[PDB]
Amino acid sequence: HVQLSLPVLQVRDVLVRGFGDSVEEALSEAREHLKNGTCGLVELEKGVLPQLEQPYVFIKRSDKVVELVAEMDGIQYGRSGITLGVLVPHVGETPIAYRNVLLRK
Amino acid sequence: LLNQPVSWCKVEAMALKPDLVNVIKDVSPPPLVVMAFSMKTMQNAKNHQNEIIAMAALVHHSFALDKAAPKPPFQSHFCVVSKPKDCIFPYAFKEVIEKKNVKVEVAATERTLLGFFLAKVHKIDPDIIVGHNIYGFELEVLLQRINVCKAPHWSKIGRLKRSNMPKGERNATCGRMICDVEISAKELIRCKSYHLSELVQQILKTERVVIPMENIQNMYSESSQLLYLLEHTWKDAKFILQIMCELNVLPLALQITNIAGNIMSRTLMGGRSERNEFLLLHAFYENNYIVPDKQIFRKPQQ
Amino acid sequence: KIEELGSELKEHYKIEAFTPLLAPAQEPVTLLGQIGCDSNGKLNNKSVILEGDREHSSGAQIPVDLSELKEYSLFPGQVVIMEGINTTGRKLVATKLYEGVPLPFYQPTEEDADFEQSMVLVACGPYTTSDSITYDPLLDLIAVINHDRP
């Protein structure tokens, strides 16, 4: 398959916090960033959500095989044993580390 | 001090009455932050739309306003580009970028491109930003592109915050200052044509290659040529900055504003009528006269 | 003439505001100007230019493109109101055109309704053939008229 290492970014250092404005374009625009190798991730903690822009793009453990799910209301997607982080574009700022996942085609 | 930040500036101040504030004169102007910026649009492949796909900017943090122009007029820069809709990037484009590792970054699409641009200009909070042809073409295409992309925190271009997009002579960049070199040169010198190329050859006595947009479509497929265009945009920013620094349009504007009592934003936008307008307003008021109301129709188109 | 027609069509079509021909705006904005042919020959669909009144566009000129436009009907010297998209400034492309409303009909009166039915003769020259001075068609029209009593 495809094995990509997505770097971890920092919440107050990101300059592009939102892929767009609607549900259908984020699921496509973000996946474009996957094929272009210009997408990072921000690991989820307490108090990180109010500093990022709705719509949100999340990476889900489908079974490191992962899948893409986008949440609007934020009820039962971020809070679980399956969430890893929030995917955001890479703007050349210095990351901290790299997290490796696998994309299912 | 109000509870919420009403602007993007560091400090805020609130006054109940105008008479609470007054004037102190015996201080020399501080130096401030100047910025150059360059961006390339391209009439879209399908049908008649502008595609702002290239970014470039020169920054000098401590820029003098009464002394000689700093040499060099910058210490850092950055560039970000993107594929608008189909202009596929060349193989190992970012790999060659990081091999040469000159100050340039890549962005996937236009929304990310302009978001990076806006957050960068926010953190730079420039007080004199300068670009070529900002009166009629580049500023308008900038606002239209941030519209179509729905750029988050769009009002961050100025130092103030406004939720709704205006429609609009100056309402765009409330807080920061735009500098168009060509109009200032048109006020000072005589040239055949005030285009950037001819201005550079007449004053800087150097040539700049004009790159047609009709050729660059295949040019997005080759890393070396695309990086040539990017460094061409960097030299464009350098030439504009050299022209403006050498011709010291900024201290000229400062002295004109101090003479005329006007707003330097209108001064740099252009029109001797407005500067001497404010001069005469000051004069008639200090001689205690009544000035006629600003003419209601307004709307100049040139 | 251009300004008069522009004002009339602006008030009839409830148009926001016209824009200078040399001022590029990305959003589709209306324009104005009379139709002319670029060269000095017969008009061709891709050889048309737009030149407006001076108070809008300094009386300047700009070539037009009709490939995007669906339906049209152009001839030199007519006013048009082209809401074409001009994002560049040096050349516009037609998106959609506005037909010009004709003048209101002359409002009649009661004495006009006080007329009975009438018929009219119409005739145009030449009244003689290519090799005659006799004006035989003229005599024929004389006979037709004094027989028909119009």
Coordinates of C-alpha atoms in Angstrom, one line a residue:
Chain A
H1 CA 0.0 0.0 0.0
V2 CA 1.1 3.6 0.8
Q3 CA 3.1 4.3 3.9
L4 CA 3.5 8.0 4.7
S5 CA 5.1 9.6 7.8
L6 CA 3.0 12.7 8.7
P7 CA 4.9 15.2 10.9
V8 CA 3.4 16.5 14.1
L9 CA 2.9 20.3 14.2
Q10 CA 2.3 22.8 17.0
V11 CA -1.1 24.5 17.6
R12 CA 0.0 28.2 17.9
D13 CA 2.6 27.9 15.1
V14 CA 0.3 26.9 12.3
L15 CA -0.7 29.5 9.6
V16 CA -3.3 27.5 7.6
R17 CA -5.8 26.1 10.1
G18 CA -8.6 25.2 7.6
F19 CA -8.7 23.4 4.3
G20 CA -11.9 25.3 3.3
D21 CA -15.5 25.9 4.3
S22 CA -17.7 22.9 3.4
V23 CA -17.8 19.2 4.1
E24 CA -17.4 18.0 0.5
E25 CA -14.4 20.1 -0.4
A26 CA -12.4 19.4 2.8
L27 CA -12.6 15.6 2.2
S28 CA -11.2 16.1 -1.3
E29 CA -8.9 19.1 -0.7
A30 CA -7.2 17.4 2.3
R31 CA -6.7 14.1 0.3
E32 CA -5.0 16.2 -2.4
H33 CA -2.5 17.2 0.3
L34 CA -1.9 13.6 1.1
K35 CA -0.9 12.9 -2.5
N36 CA 1.2 16.0 -2.6
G37 CA 3.0 15.2 0.6
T38 CA 2.3 18.6 2.2
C39 CA 0.0 17.6 5.1
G40 CA 0.9 17.5 8.8
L41 CA -0.9 16.5 12.0
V42 CA -1.6 18.1 15.4
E43 CA -1.9 15.6 18.3
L44 CA -5.1 16.1 20.3
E45 CA -5.1 17.4 23.9
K46 CA -7.3 19.5 26.1
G47 CA -7.8 23.0 24.9
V48 CA -6.5 22.5 21.3
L49 CA -9.8 22.5 19.5
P50 CA -10.6 26.3 20.0
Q51 CA -7.4 27.2 18.1
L52 CA -8.3 25.4 14.9
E53 CA -10.9 26.3 12.3
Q54 CA -14.1 24.4 11.5
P55 CA -14.3 22.3 9.3
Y56 CA -11.9 19.8 10.9
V57 CA -10.2 16.9 9.3
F58 CA -9.5 13.8 11.5
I59 CA -7.5 10.6 11.0
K60 CA -9.2 7.4 12.2
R61 CA -7.7 4.0 13.0
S62 CA -9.6 1.7 10.6
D63 CA -8.0 -1.4 12.0
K64 CA -0.6 1.8 10.4
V65 CA -3.7 1.6 8.3
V66 CA -5.9 4.7 8.8
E67 CA -9.0 6.4 7.3
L68 CA -10.3 9.9 6.9
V69 CA -13.3 11.3 8.8
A70 CA -14.4 14.9 9.2
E71 CA -16.5 16.1 12.1
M72 CA -18.8 19.1 12.3
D73 CA -20.5 19.0 15.8
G74 CA -17.6 17.3 17.6
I75 CA -19.7 15.0 19.8
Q76 CA -18.4 11.4 19.3
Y77 CA -15.4 11.7 17.0
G78 CA -12.5 13.4 18.8
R79 CA -13.2 11.7 22.2
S80 CA -12.5 8.0 21.7
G81 CA -9.7 5.5 21.7
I82 CA -9.4 5.8 17.9
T83 CA -8.5 9.4 17.4
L84 CA -4.8 10.3 16.7
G85 CA -4.8 14.0 15.7
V86 CA -6.1 16.7 13.4
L87 CA -4.6 16.9 9.9
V88 CA -3.5 20.4 8.7
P89 CA -1.5 21.6 5.7
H90 CA 2.3 22.0 6.0
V91 CA 3.6 25.5 5.6
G92 CA 7.3 24.9 6.1
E93 CA 7.4 25.7 9.8
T94 CA 9.6 23.4 11.8
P95 CA 7.7 20.3 13.1
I96 CA 8.7 18.3 16.2
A97 CA 8.6 14.6 15.0
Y98 CA 7.0 12.4 12.5
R99 CA 4.1 9.9 12.8
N100 CA 3.9 7.1 10.2
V101 CA 0.5 5.8 9.0
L102 CA -0.9 3.9 6.0
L103 CA -3.5 5.1 3.6
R104 CA -6.1 2.6 2.3
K105 CA -6.9 2.8 -1.4
Chain B
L1 CA -8.5 49.6 28.0
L2 CA -11.5 47.7 26.6
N3 CA -12.0 44.0 27.3
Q4 CA -11.5 42.7 23.8
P5 CA -8.9 43.3 21.2
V6 CA -10.5 45.6 18.6
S7 CA -7.5 45.4 16.3
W8 CA -4.5 43.2 15.7
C9 CA -2.1 45.7 17.2
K10 CA -0.3 44.9 20.4
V11 CA -1.7 47.8 22.5
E12 CA -5.1 49.4 22.6
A13 CA -6.3 52.8 24.0
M14 CA -9.8 54.2 24.5
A15 CA -10.7 57.9 24.9
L16 CA -14.0 59.4 25.9
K17 CA -13.5 62.9 24.3
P18 CA -11.2 64.2 21.6
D19 CA -9.8 67.0 23.9
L20 CA -8.3 64.3 26.2
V21 CA -5.5 63.9 23.7
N22 CA -3.0 66.5 22.7
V23 CA 0.2 67.1 20.7
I24 CA 3.9 66.8 21.5
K25 CA 6.3 67.8 18.8
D26 CA 10.0 67.7 19.9
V27 CA 10.6 64.0 19.1
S28 CA 12.3 62.5 16.1
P29 CA 10.3 59.8 14.2
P30 CA 11.0 56.3 15.2
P31 CA 12.3 53.9 12.5
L32 CA 9.6 51.4 11.5
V33 CA 9.2 48.1 9.6
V34 CA 9.2 48.2 5.8
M35 CA 8.1 45.3 3.6
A36 CA 8.3 44.5 -0.1
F37 CA 6.0 41.9 -1.6
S38 CA 5.6 40.3 -5.0
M39 CA 2.9 37.9 -6.3
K40 CA 2.3 36.4 -9.8
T41 CA -1.2 35.9 -11.2
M42 CA -2.0 34.0 -14.3
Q43 CA -5.2 34.1 -16.5
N44 CA -6.6 30.7 -15.6
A45 CA -6.3 27.9 -18.1
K46 CA -10.0 27.2 -18.7
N47 CA -11.8 30.6 -18.9
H48 CA -10.8 34.1 -17.8
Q49 CA -9.9 34.0 -14.1
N50 CA -6.9 35.3 -12.2
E51 CA -4.8 32.7 -10.4
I52 CA -2.5 34.3 -7.8
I53 CA -0.1 31.3 -7.5
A54 CA 3.3 32.9 -6.4
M55 CA 4.4 34.7 -3.3
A56 CA 7.5 36.7 -2.5
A57 CA 8.4 39.3 0.1
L58 CA 11.4 41.3 1.3
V59 CA 11.5 42.4 5.0
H60 CA 13.7 44.9 6.8
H61 CA 12.7 45.1 10.4
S62 CA 14.4 48.3 11.4
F63 CA 14.0 50.7 8.5
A64 CA 15.1 54.3 8.8
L65 CA 12.8 57.1 7.7
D66 CA 15.0 60.2 8.1
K67 CA 18.5 58.7 7.5
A68 CA 20.0 57.0 4.4
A69 CA 18.3 54.0 3.0
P70 CA 19.7 50.8 4.6
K71 CA 22.0 48.8 2.4
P72 CA 21.0 46.0 1.9
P73 CA 17.3 47.0 2.3
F74 CA 16.5 43.5 3.6
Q75 CA 17.8 40.7 5.7
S76 CA 15.3 37.8 5.1
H77 CA 12.7 36.7 2.5
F78 CA 10.3 33.8 1.8
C79 CA 8.4 32.4 -1.1
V80 CA 5.4 30.0 -1.4
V81 CA 3.8 28.7 -4.7
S82 CA 1.0 26.4 -5.6
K83 CA -0.6 24.5 -8.4
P84 CA -3.8 26.5 -9.2
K85 CA -6.0 23.7 -10.6
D86 CA -3.9 21.5 -13.1
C87 CA -0.4 22.9 -13.4
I88 CA 1.3 19.8 -12.0
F89 CA 4.5 20.5 -10.1
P90 CA 7.7 19.0 -11.6
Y91 CA 9.2 15.8 -10.3
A92 CA 11.1 16.3 -7.0
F93 CA 10.3 20.0 -7.0
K94 CA 10.5 20.4 -3.3
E95 CA 13.5 18.1 -3.2
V96 CA 15.5 20.4 -5.5
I97 CA 14.2 23.3 -3.4
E98 CA 15.6 21.8 -0.2
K99 CA 18.8 20.8 -2.0
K100 CA 19.4 24.4 -2.9
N101 CA 17.7 25.3 0.5
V102 CA 17.3 28.9 -0.4
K103 CA 14.6 30.7 1.5
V104 CA 11.5 29.3 -0.3
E105 CA 8.5 27.1 0.7
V106 CA 5.8 25.2 -1.2
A107 CA 2.0 25.3 -0.7
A108 CA -0.4 22.7 -2.1
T109 CA -3.3 25.0 -3.2
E110 CA -4.4 28.6 -3.3
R111 CA -6.3 28.6 0.0
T112 CA -3.2 27.4 1.9
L113 CA -1.1 29.8 -0.1
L114 CA -3.1 32.9 0.8
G115 CA -3.6 31.7 4.4
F116 CA 0.2 31.5 4.8
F117 CA 0.5 34.9 3.2
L118 CA -2.1 36.4 5.5
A119 CA -0.7 34.9 8.7
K120 CA 2.9 35.9 7.7
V121 CA 1.8 39.5 7.0
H122 CA 0.1 39.5 10.4
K123 CA 3.2 38.4 12.3
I124 CA 5.2 40.9 10.3
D125 CA 2.7 43.7 10.9
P126 CA 4.5 45.9 8.4
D127 CA 4.0 49.7 8.5
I128 CA 5.2 50.3 4.9
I129 CA 4.4 47.5 2.5
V130 CA 5.4 48.1 -1.1
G131 CA 4.5 46.5 -4.4
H132 CA 4.1 47.4 -8.0
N133 CA 0.7 48.3 -9.5
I134 CA -1.3 48.1 -6.3
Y135 CA -3.7 50.9 -7.2
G136 CA -5.7 49.1 -9.9
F137 CA -4.6 45.5 -10.5
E138 CA -2.8 43.7 -7.7
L139 CA -4.8 44.9 -4.6
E140 CA -8.1 44.3 -6.4
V141 CA -7.0 40.8 -7.6
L142 CA -5.8 40.2 -4.0
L143 CA -9.2 41.0 -2.5
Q144 CA -11.0 39.0 -5.2
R145 CA -8.8 36.0 -4.6
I146 CA -9.2 36.1 -0.8
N147 CA -12.9 36.4 -1.6
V148 CA -13.1 33.3 -3.8
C149 CA -10.8 31.4 -1.4
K150 CA -12.7 32.8 1.6
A151 CA -9.4 33.5 3.4
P152 CA -9.8 33.0 7.2
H153 CA -9.4 36.2 9.2
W154 CA -9.4 38.1 5.8
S155 CA -9.3 41.5 7.5
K156 CA -5.8 40.7 8.9
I157 CA -4.4 42.5 5.8
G158 CA -5.0 45.6 7.8
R159 CA -4.3 45.9 11.5
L160 CA -8.0 46.2 12.2
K161 CA -10.7 43.5 12.2
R162 CA -13.8 43.6 10.1
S163 CA -16.1 40.5 9.6
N164 CA -17.8 41.7 6.4
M165 CA -15.8 42.4 3.2
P166 CA -16.2 46.0 2.0
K167 CA -17.3 47.5 -1.3
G168 CA -14.0 50.5 -1.2
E169 CA -11.2 52.9 -2.1
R170 CA -9.3 52.3 1.1
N171 CA -11.5 50.2 3.3
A172 CA -9.3 47.1 2.6
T173 CA -6.1 47.5 4.5
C174 CA -7.1 49.7 7.5
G175 CA -4.0 49.6 9.7
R176 CA -1.2 49.0 7.3
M177 CA 0.2 51.1 4.5
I178 CA 0.5 50.3 0.8
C179 CA 3.2 51.8 -1.3
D180 CA 3.0 51.9 -5.1
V181 CA 6.3 52.9 -6.6
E182 CA 5.1 53.7 -10.1
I183 CA 2.8 56.5 -9.1
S184 CA 5.5 58.1 -6.9
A185 CA 7.9 57.9 -9.8
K186 CA 5.3 59.5 -12.0
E187 CA 5.2 62.4 -9.6
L188 CA 9.0 62.8 -9.5
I189 CA 10.6 61.8 -12.8
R190 CA 9.8 61.6 -16.5
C191 CA 9.8 58.2 -18.2
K192 CA 8.5 56.8 -21.5
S193 CA 6.2 54.3 -19.8
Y194 CA 5.8 53.8 -16.0
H195 CA 5.9 50.0 -16.3
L196 CA 8.3 48.3 -14.0
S197 CA 10.6 47.2 -16.8
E198 CA 11.1 50.6 -18.3
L199 CA 11.3 52.3 -14.9
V200 CA 14.2 49.9 -14.0
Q201 CA 16.1 50.5 -17.2
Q202 CA 15.7 54.3 -17.0
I203 CA 16.6 54.6 -13.4
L204 CA 18.4 51.5 -12.2
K205 CA 19.9 51.0 -15.7
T206 CA 19.3 47.3 -15.5
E207 CA 17.1 45.0 -17.7
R208 CA 14.4 42.7 -16.4
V209 CA 13.1 39.9 -18.6
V210 CA 9.4 40.0 -19.2
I211 CA 7.9 36.5 -18.9
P212 CA 4.7 35.9 -20.9
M213 CA 1.9 34.0 -19.2
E214 CA 1.2 32.3 -22.5
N215 CA 4.4 30.2 -22.1
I216 CA 4.4 29.3 -18.5
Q217 CA 1.8 26.5 -18.6
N218 CA 4.4 23.9 -19.7
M219 CA 6.9 25.8 -17.6
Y220 CA 5.1 24.5 -14.4
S221 CA 6.4 21.1 -15.5
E222 CA 10.1 21.8 -15.2
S223 CA 11.7 22.5 -11.8
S224 CA 14.7 24.5 -13.1
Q225 CA 12.6 26.9 -15.1
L226 CA 9.9 27.3 -12.4
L227 CA 12.6 28.1 -9.9
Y228 CA 14.0 30.5 -12.4
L229 CA 10.6 32.3 -12.4
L230 CA 10.6 32.2 -8.6
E231 CA 14.0 33.8 -8.4
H232 CA 12.9 36.2 -11.1
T233 CA 10.1 37.3 -8.8
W234 CA 12.7 37.6 -6.0
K235 CA 14.8 39.9 -8.2
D236 CA 11.5 41.8 -9.0
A237 CA 11.1 42.4 -5.3
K238 CA 14.7 43.4 -5.1
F239 CA 14.5 45.9 -8.0
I240 CA 11.3 47.5 -6.6
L241 CA 12.9 47.8 -3.1
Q242 CA 16.1 49.3 -4.7
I243 CA 14.1 51.8 -6.7
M244 CA 12.0 52.9 -3.7
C245 CA 15.0 53.0 -1.3
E246 CA 17.3 54.9 -3.7
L247 CA 14.5 57.4 -4.6
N248 CA 13.6 57.7 -0.8
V249 CA 9.9 58.2 -1.6
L250 CA 9.3 57.5 2.1
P251 CA 11.0 60.5 3.7
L252 CA 9.7 62.6 0.8
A253 CA 6.2 61.5 1.8
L254 CA 6.9 62.1 5.5
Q255 CA 8.0 65.7 4.8
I256 CA 5.0 66.3 2.5
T257 CA 2.6 65.0 5.1
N258 CA 4.2 67.1 7.9
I259 CA 3.8 70.2 5.7
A260 CA 0.3 69.5 4.6
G261 CA -1.3 68.1 7.8
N262 CA -2.8 65.3 5.7
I263 CA -3.1 61.5 6.1
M264 CA 0.0 59.7 4.8
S265 CA -2.3 56.9 3.5
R266 CA -4.0 59.3 1.1
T267 CA -0.6 60.9 0.4
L268 CA 0.9 57.6 -0.8
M269 CA -2.3 56.6 -2.6
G270 CA -1.9 59.8 -4.6
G271 CA -3.4 63.1 -5.5
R272 CA -1.8 66.4 -4.8
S273 CA -5.4 67.7 -4.4
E274 CA -5.9 65.8 -1.1
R275 CA -2.6 66.8 0.5
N276 CA -3.0 70.5 -0.3
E277 CA -6.7 70.0 0.7
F278 CA -5.7 69.1 4.2
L279 CA -3.1 71.9 4.2
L280 CA -5.8 74.5 3.4
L281 CA -8.2 73.0 5.9
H282 CA -5.6 73.5 8.6
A283 CA -4.9 77.0 7.3
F284 CA -8.6 78.1 7.2
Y285 CA -9.2 76.6 10.6
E286 CA -6.2 78.2 12.3
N287 CA -7.4 81.5 10.8
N288 CA -10.9 80.5 12.1
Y289 CA -12.8 80.1 8.8
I290 CA -15.6 77.7 7.7
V291 CA -14.5 75.1 5.1
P292 CA -17.1 73.9 2.6
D293 CA -18.4 70.3 3.0
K294 CA -16.6 67.5 1.2
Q295 CA -18.3 67.2 -2.2
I296 CA -20.9 64.5 -1.9
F297 CA -20.5 62.7 -5.3
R298 CA -16.8 61.9 -4.7
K299 CA -16.0 58.8 -6.8
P300 CA -12.9 59.6 -8.8
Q301 CA -12.0 56.8 -11.2
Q302 CA -8.4 57.5 -12.0
Chain C
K1 CA -25.4 59.4 -28.2
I2 CA -23.5 56.7 -26.3
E3 CA -24.2 58.4 -23.0
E4 CA -27.9 58.9 -23.7
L5 CA -28.4 55.2 -24.6
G6 CA -26.3 54.1 -21.7
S7 CA -28.4 56.2 -19.2
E8 CA -31.6 54.9 -20.7
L9 CA -30.6 51.3 -20.6
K10 CA -29.1 51.7 -17.0
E11 CA -32.4 53.1 -15.7
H12 CA -34.5 50.4 -17.6
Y13 CA -32.3 47.5 -16.5
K14 CA -31.7 48.6 -12.9
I15 CA -27.9 48.3 -13.4
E16 CA -25.7 49.0 -10.4
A17 CA -22.9 51.0 -12.0
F18 CA -20.7 50.8 -15.1
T19 CA -16.9 50.4 -14.9
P20 CA -14.1 51.9 -16.9
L21 CA -13.0 49.7 -19.9
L22 CA -9.3 49.8 -18.7
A23 CA -10.1 49.0 -15.1
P24 CA -9.7 45.2 -14.6
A25 CA -12.2 43.6 -12.1
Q26 CA -12.3 39.8 -11.6
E27 CA -16.0 39.7 -10.7
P28 CA -18.3 40.1 -13.8
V29 CA -19.1 43.8 -14.0
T30 CA -21.0 45.6 -16.7
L31 CA -19.4 47.7 -19.4
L32 CA -20.6 50.1 -22.1
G33 CA -19.6 51.3 -25.5
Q34 CA -20.4 51.2 -29.2
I35 CA -19.5 48.4 -31.5
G36 CA -16.8 48.8 -34.1
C37 CA -14.7 46.7 -36.5
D38 CA -11.0 46.4 -35.6
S39 CA -9.7 46.7 -39.2
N40 CA -11.1 48.6 -42.1
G41 CA -12.8 45.7 -44.0
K42 CA -16.0 43.8 -43.5
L43 CA -16.9 42.9 -39.9
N44 CA -15.9 39.4 -38.7
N45 CA -17.1 37.8 -35.6
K46 CA -13.6 37.8 -34.0
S47 CA -12.7 41.3 -35.4
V48 CA -14.8 43.4 -33.2
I49 CA -13.8 46.1 -30.7
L50 CA -15.5 48.0 -27.9
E51 CA -15.1 51.7 -27.3
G52 CA -17.1 53.6 -24.7
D53 CA -18.0 57.1 -23.7
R54 CA -15.3 59.3 -22.2
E55 CA -16.9 59.8 -18.7
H56 CA -16.7 56.0 -18.1
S57 CA -13.6 54.9 -20.1
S58 CA -11.8 58.0 -21.4
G59 CA -13.2 57.1 -24.9
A60 CA -10.6 54.3 -25.2
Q61 CA -10.9 51.0 -27.1
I62 CA -10.7 47.3 -26.4
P63 CA -11.2 44.2 -28.5
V64 CA -14.0 41.8 -27.7
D65 CA -14.4 38.0 -27.8
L66 CA -17.7 36.3 -28.5
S67 CA -16.7 32.6 -28.2
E68 CA -18.1 32.4 -24.7
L69 CA -21.2 34.4 -25.6
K70 CA -24.2 32.2 -26.6
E71 CA -26.4 34.5 -28.7
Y72 CA -25.8 38.0 -30.0
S73 CA -26.4 40.3 -32.9
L74 CA -23.8 43.0 -33.6
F75 CA -23.2 45.6 -36.3
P76 CA -20.8 48.6 -36.2
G77 CA -22.1 51.8 -34.6
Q78 CA -24.7 50.3 -32.2
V79 CA -24.7 50.8 -28.4
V80 CA -24.3 47.7 -26.3
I81 CA -24.3 47.0 -22.6
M82 CA -21.9 44.1 -22.2
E83 CA -21.7 42.6 -18.7
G84 CA -18.6 40.7 -19.8
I85 CA -15.8 39.6 -17.5
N86 CA -12.6 41.7 -17.8
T87 CA -10.1 40.5 -15.3
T88 CA -7.1 41.6 -17.3
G89 CA -7.9 45.0 -18.8
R90 CA -6.4 44.6 -22.3
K91 CA -9.2 42.3 -23.7
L92 CA -12.6 41.3 -22.6
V93 CA -14.7 38.2 -23.2
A94 CA -18.4 38.3 -23.7
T95 CA -20.6 36.5 -21.1
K96 CA -24.0 37.8 -21.8
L97 CA -25.5 40.9 -23.6
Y98 CA -28.5 43.1 -22.9
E99 CA -31.0 43.8 -25.6
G100 CA -32.0 47.5 -26.0
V101 CA -35.6 48.3 -25.1
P102 CA -37.2 50.3 -28.0
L103 CA -39.0 53.6 -27.5
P104 CA -42.6 53.6 -26.2
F105 CA -45.2 53.8 -28.9
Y106 CA -46.7 57.2 -29.5
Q107 CA -49.7 57.4 -27.3
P108 CA -52.9 58.1 -29.4
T109 CA -55.9 60.3 -28.6
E110 CA -59.7 60.2 -29.2
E111 CA -59.4 62.1 -32.5
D112 CA -57.1 59.4 -33.7
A113 CA -59.9 56.9 -32.9
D114 CA -62.1 59.3 -34.8
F115 CA -60.5 58.3 -38.1
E116 CA -61.9 55.7 -40.6
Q117 CA -59.9 53.1 -42.5
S118 CA -57.4 54.5 -45.1
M119 CA -54.9 53.0 -47.5
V120 CA -51.5 54.4 -48.7
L121 CA -49.5 54.2 -51.9
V122 CA -45.8 53.6 -51.6
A123 CA -43.3 53.5 -54.4
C124 CA -39.5 53.9 -54.8
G125 CA -37.3 54.7 -57.7
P126 CA -35.9 54.1 -60.2
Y127 CA -39.0 55.1 -62.3
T128 CA -37.3 54.2 -65.6
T129 CA -35.4 51.3 -67.0
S130 CA -31.6 51.1 -67.4
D131 CA -31.8 52.4 -71.0
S132 CA -34.8 54.7 -71.1
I133 CA -36.0 58.3 -70.5
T134 CA -39.6 57.6 -71.3
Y135 CA -40.5 56.6 -67.7
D136 CA -42.9 53.9 -68.6
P137 CA -43.1 52.8 -65.0
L138 CA -44.0 56.4 -64.1
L139 CA -46.8 56.4 -66.6
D140 CA -47.9 53.0 -65.2
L141 CA -48.0 54.4 -61.7
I142 CA -50.0 57.4 -62.9
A143 CA -52.5 55.0 -64.4
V144 CA -52.6 52.9 -61.2
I145 CA -53.2 55.9 -59.0
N146 CA -55.9 57.6 -61.1
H147 CA -57.6 54.3 -61.4
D148 CA -57.4 53.3 -57.7
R149 CA -58.1 56.7 -56.1
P150 CA -56.0 56.2 -52.9

